[PDB]
Short mmCIF file of C-alpha atoms and ligand atoms in Angstrom, two decimals:
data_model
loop_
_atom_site.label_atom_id
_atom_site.label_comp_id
_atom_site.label_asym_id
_atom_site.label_seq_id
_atom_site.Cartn_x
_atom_site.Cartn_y
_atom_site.Cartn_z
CA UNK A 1 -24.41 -20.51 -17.71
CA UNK A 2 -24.61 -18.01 -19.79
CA UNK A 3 -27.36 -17.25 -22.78
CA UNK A 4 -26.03 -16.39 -26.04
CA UNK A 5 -27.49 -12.84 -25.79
CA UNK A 6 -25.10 -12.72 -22.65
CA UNK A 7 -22.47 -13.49 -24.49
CA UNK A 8 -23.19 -10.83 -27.28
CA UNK A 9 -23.61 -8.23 -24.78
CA UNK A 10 -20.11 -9.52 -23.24
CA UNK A 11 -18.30 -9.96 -26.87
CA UNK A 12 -19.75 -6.17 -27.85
CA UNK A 13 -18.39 -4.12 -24.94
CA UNK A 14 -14.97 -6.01 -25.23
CA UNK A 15 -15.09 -4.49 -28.93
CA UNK A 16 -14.52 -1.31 -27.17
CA UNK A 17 -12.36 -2.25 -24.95
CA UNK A 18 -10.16 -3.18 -28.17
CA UNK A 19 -10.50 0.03 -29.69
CA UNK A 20 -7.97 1.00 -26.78
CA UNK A 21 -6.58 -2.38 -25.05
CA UNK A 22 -3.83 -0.15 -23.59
CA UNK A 23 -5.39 2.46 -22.14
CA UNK A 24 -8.21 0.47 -20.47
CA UNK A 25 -5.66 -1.68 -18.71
CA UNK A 26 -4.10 1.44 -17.20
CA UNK A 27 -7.27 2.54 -16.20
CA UNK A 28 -8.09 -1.02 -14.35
CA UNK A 29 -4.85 -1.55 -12.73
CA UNK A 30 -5.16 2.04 -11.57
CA UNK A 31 -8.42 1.90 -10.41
CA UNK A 32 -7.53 -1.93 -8.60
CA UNK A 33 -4.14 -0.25 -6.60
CA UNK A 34 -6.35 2.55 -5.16
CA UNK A 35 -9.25 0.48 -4.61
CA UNK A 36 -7.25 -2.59 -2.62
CA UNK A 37 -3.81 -1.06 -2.20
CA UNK A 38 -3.22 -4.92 -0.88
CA UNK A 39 -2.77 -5.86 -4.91
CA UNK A 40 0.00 -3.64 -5.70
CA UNK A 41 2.01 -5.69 -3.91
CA UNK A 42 1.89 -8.50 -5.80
CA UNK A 43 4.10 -5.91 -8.65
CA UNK A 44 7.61 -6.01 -7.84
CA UNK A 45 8.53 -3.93 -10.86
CA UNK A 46 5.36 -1.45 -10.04
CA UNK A 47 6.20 -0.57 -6.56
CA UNK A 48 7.89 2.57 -7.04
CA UNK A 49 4.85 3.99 -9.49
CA UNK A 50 3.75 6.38 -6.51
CA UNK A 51 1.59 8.40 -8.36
CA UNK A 52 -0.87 8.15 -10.84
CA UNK A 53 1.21 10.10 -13.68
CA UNK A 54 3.82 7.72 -13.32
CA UNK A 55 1.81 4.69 -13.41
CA UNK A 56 -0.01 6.33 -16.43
CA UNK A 57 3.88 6.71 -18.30
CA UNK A 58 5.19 3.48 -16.89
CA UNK A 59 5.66 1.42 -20.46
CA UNK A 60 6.21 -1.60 -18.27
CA UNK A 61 2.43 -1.50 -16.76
CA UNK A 62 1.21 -0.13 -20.15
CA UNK A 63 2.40 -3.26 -21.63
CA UNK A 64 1.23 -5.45 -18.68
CA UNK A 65 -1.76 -4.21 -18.79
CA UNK A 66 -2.38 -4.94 -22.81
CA UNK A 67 -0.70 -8.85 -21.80
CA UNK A 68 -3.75 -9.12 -19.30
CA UNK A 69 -6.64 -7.81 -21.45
CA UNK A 70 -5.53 -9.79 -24.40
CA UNK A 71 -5.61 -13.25 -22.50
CA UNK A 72 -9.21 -12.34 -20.85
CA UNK A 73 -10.35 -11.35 -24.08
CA UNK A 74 -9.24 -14.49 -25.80
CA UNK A 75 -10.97 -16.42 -23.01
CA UNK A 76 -14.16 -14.33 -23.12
CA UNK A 77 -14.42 -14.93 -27.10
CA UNK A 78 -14.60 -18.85 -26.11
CA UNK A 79 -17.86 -18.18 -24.75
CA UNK A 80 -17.39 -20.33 -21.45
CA UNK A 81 -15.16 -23.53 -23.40
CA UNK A 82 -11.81 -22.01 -22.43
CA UNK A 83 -10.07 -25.40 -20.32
CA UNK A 84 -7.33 -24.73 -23.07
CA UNK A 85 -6.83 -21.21 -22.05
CA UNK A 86 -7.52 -21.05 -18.48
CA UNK A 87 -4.99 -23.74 -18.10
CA UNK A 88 -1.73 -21.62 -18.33
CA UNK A 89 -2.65 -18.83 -16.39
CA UNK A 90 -3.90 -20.77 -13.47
CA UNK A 91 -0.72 -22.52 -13.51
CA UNK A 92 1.43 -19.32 -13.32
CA UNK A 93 -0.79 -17.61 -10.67
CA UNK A 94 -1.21 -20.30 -8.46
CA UNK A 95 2.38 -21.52 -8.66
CA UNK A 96 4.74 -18.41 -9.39
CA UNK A 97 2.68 -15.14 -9.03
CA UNK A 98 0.49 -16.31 -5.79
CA UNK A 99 -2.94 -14.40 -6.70
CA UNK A 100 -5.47 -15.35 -4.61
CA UNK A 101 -9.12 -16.19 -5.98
CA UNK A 102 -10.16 -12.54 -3.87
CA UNK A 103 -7.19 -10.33 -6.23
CA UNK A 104 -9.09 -11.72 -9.55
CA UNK A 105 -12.91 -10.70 -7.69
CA UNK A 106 -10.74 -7.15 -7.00
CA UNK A 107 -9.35 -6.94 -10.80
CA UNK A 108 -12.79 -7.64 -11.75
CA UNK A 109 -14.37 -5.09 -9.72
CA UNK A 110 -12.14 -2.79 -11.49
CA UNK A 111 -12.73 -3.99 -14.93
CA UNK A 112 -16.31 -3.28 -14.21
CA UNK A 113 -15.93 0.19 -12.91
CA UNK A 114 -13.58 0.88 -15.93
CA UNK A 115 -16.17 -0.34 -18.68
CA UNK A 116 -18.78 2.03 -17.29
CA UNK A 117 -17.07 5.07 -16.85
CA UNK A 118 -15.80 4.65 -20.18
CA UNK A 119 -18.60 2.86 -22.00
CA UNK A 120 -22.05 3.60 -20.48
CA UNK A 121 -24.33 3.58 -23.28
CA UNK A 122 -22.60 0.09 -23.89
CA UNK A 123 -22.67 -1.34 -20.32
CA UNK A 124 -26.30 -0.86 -19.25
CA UNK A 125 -27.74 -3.42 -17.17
CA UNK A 126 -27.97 -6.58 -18.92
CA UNK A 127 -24.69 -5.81 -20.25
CA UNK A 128 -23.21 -5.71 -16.83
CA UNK A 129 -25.10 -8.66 -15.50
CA UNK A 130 -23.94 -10.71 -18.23
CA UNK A 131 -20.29 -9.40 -17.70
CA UNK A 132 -20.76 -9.93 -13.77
CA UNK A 133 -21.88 -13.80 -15.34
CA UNK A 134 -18.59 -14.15 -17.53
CA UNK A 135 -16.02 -12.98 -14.86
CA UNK A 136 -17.91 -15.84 -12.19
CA UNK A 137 -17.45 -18.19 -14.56
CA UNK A 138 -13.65 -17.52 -15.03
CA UNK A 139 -12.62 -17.30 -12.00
CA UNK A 140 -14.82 -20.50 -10.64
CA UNK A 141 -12.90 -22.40 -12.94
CA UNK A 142 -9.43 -20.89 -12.48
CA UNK A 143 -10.58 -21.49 -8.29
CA UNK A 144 -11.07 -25.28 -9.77
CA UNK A 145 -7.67 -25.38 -11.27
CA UNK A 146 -6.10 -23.61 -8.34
CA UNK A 147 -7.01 -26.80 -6.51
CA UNK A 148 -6.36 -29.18 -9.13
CA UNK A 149 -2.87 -28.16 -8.64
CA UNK A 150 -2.63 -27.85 -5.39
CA UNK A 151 -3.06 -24.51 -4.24
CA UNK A 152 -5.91 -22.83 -2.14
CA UNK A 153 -6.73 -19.69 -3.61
C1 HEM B 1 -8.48 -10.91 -15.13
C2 HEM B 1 -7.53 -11.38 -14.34
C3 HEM B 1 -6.15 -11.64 -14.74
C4 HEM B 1 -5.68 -12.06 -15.94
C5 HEM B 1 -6.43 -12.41 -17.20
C6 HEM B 1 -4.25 -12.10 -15.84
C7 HEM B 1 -3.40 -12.46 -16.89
C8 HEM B 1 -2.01 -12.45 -16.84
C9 HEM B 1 -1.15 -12.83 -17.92
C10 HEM B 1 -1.59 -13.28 -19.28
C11 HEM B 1 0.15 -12.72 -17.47
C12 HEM B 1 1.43 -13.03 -18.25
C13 HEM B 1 1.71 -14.55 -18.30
C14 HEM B 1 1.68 -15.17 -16.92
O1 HEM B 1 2.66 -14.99 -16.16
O2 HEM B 1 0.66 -15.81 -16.55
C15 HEM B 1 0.05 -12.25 -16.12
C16 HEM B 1 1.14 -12.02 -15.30
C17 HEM B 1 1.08 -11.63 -13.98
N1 HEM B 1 -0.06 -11.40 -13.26
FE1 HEM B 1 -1.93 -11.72 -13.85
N2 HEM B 1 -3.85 -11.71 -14.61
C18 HEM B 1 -4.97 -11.41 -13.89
C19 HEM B 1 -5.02 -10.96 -12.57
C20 HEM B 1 -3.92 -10.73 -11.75
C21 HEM B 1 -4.03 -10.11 -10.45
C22 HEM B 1 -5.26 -9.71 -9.74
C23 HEM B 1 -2.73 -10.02 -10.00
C24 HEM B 1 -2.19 -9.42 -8.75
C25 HEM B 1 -2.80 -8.65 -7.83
C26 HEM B 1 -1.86 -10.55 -11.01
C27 HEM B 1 -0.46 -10.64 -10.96
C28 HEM B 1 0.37 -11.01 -12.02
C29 HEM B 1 1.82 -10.96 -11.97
C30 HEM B 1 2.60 -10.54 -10.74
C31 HEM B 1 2.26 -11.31 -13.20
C32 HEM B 1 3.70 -11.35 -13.68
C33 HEM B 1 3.98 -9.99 -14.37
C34 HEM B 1 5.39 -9.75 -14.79
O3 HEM B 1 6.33 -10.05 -14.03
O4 HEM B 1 5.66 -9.20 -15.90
N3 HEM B 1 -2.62 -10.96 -12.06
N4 HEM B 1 -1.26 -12.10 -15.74
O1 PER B 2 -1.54 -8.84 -13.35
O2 PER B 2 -1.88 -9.87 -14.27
CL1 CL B 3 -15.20 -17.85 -21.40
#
C-alpha cells in the first residue's frame, strides 16, 4: 500500500510527464528497445525503426507512445482502485499482444530512467520509491488478471 504522500509524490511527477506525454513516451520506448532489445519484438509495425532518428520521427510510435502514458496515467490518478481500468488492458495483453509480466518490469525500468533524466529535482528519493510502489502495484494486479484469464505471464 501506498501512503497518500506516495501518491502525491506519484500524481506530481506525472504532472510533468503531461507537460510533454509525447515526448516522454519516445524517450521510454527508446530507452526499453536498447535496454531489452527482446521487447521490440513484440512491435510489428516498429521493426524497421533501426535507428534512433527514425524511431524519434515515427508518428506511429509517437502516437503509441501518448496511447500508453495516457492509460497509466489514468490508472495512477486512481490511487491503487483501478479494477475498472486494469481490466481492459490485461485482457488485450494477455490475450492478443502476449506481454509477459517481465516486458511491463522492463517498460517500467524505463519509465523510471526517463523521469530522472528528465525530472530530477522532481524524482528524488521518496519520489522514486513511491513510483517504484505504484508500478508493483500495477503490475501485481495485471499478473492477477493475467491468471484470472488464463494466461501465465
Ligand atoms: C506501462 C505498461 C503498459 C501500458 C500502460 C500499456 C498500455 C497499452 C494500451 C493502452 C494499448 C492500446 C490498447 C490495447 O491494445 O490494450 C497498448 C497496446 C499495445 N501494447 Fe501495451 N502497454 C504497456 C506495456 C507494453 C509492453 C511492455 C509491450 C511490449 C513489449 C506492449 C505491447 C503492446 C502492443 C504490441 C500493443 C498494440 C499496439 C498497436 O498495434 O497499435 N505493451 N498498450
Ligand atoms: O506498448 O504498449
Ligand atoms: Cl493505481
Amino acid at each position: 500500500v501506498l501512503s497518500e504522500g506516495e501518491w502525491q509524490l506519484v500524481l506530481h511527477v506525472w504532472a510533468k510527464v503531461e507537460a510533454d506525454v509525447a515526448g516522454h513516451g519516445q524517450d521510454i520506448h527508446i530507452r526499453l528497445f536498447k535496454s531489452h532489445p527482446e521487447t521490440l519484438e513484440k512491435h510489428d509495425r516498429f521493426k524497421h525503426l533501426k535507428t534512433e532518428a527514425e524511431m524519434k520521427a515515427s508518428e506511429d510510435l509517437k502516437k503509441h507512445g501518448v496511447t500508453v502514458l495516457t492509460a497509466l496515467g489514468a490508472i495512477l490518478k486512481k490511487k491503487g482502485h483501478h479494477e475498472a481500468e486494469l481490466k481492459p488492458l490485461a485482457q488485450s495483453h494477455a490475450t492478443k499482444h502476449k506481454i509477459p509480466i517481465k516486458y511491463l518490469e522492463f517498460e517500467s525500468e524505463a519509465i523510471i530512467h526517463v523521469l530522472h533524466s528528465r525530472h530530477p529535482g522532481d524524482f528524488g528519493a521518496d519520489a522514486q520509491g513511491a513510483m517504484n510502489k505504484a508500478l508493483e502495484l500495477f503490475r501485481k494486479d495485471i499478473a492477477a488478471k493475467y491468471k484470472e484469464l488464463g494466461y501465465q505471464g
